[PDB]
Design a protein around this ligand. Structure first.
Ligand SMILES: [Mg+2]
Ligand SMILES: [Mg+2]
Lengths: 194, 194
């Protein structure tokens, strides 16, 4: 009966791409980098790996460092939109996020970041998982173009959240986008209601 | 097509009740305690709270301490059973576990514990969530008697794993139990296959 919406964290609530570039440039000032406008493909480390040998490992070292996830800044409008979305009648919102492989800091900092921007009671809405296809819901708003896993037919409709790395992608017709949190997310939710 | 099975962590893979009692007695040797045979009800802190004022907070302080989750011992047969279950054809296993409210150590230690007993590649099968009803699967093996959340009609069948706190419970007829990992878990899985 309640519409269930899963909202991604990196690239949707938290500005992973800008935080990464800033810290990469500060730590490795003598290395070439990729301006956000020139980002292509989901995996940051793969594109850095193509720009020069050893750069993929240096890029990885930035998000594996302590405080990287905790210090990410929210995207404009994200905190306000998700707070409003969660307060809507017949609407349950969960933050569904995938941790990186090195787990020393990332899970902990993601819970701390949600507590900081949404409060202690919102911690109950977090789902950490590498596989989002096994989480059931009506909608998944996520900036990754291809979301796959153990369930071949996920129950949610994936709405692609725009990001520097996917903004030029042409999607297969059925597929929809949410361009930013300033875009009309309520209309998307309502199109899925009974 | 593959059968999907969710396996709980505390009380099913990891011996939370015995680890808790041991550490509680070592830290608070002058306080009364609850022998496992006398445990009743899911929430440990509630029963300790009834045995003497201030004991609920002392009990909580044990599982909120660093290394409590990481040092839990596996239940007999659990690691071997889940490793065999995951290697079965047409069978996907996920560890679905709910962290406690204080998140400084628990999520991190649960990933570290899975890495220790199942290896780095199994970290991909972990789902951390307070709400297991939004995870879809064919079966959920979990020692908690009443598992509820945002989805009123979960897709999985909940098989109750026996624990000191639920061993005397009479379940409503349809409901099934797995008595220990020595019990016949393969027969349970097979009863759900096509
Ligand atoms: Mg993302
Ligand atoms: Mg349990």
């Amino acid at each position: 009966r309640a519409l269930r919406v899963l909202v991604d964290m990196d690239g949707v609530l938290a500005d992973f791409e800008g935080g990464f570039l800033r810290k990469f440039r500060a730590r490795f000032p003598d290395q070439p980098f990729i301006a956000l406008e020139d980002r292509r493909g989901f995996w940051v480390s793969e594109q850095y790996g193509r720009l020069r040998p050893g750069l993929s490992e240096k890029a990885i070292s930035i998000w594996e460092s302590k405080n990287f996830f905790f210090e990410l800044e929210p995207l404009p409008g994200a905190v306000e939109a998700v707070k409003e979305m969660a307060s809507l009648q017949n609407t349950d919102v969960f933050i569904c996020t995938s941790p990186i492989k090195m787990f020393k800091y990332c899970p902990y900092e993601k819970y701390a970041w949600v507590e900081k921007y949404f409060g202690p009671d919102f911690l109950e809405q977090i789902v950490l998982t590498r596989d989002k296809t096994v989480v059931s819901a009506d909608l998944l708003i996520d900036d990754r173009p291809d979301i796959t896993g153990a369930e071949p037919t996920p129950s949610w409709e994936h709405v692609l959240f725009t990001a520097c790395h996917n903004q030029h992608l042409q999607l297969q017709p059925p597929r929809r986008r949410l361009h930013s949190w300033a875009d009309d997310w309520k209309a998307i939710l309502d199109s899925k209601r009974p």
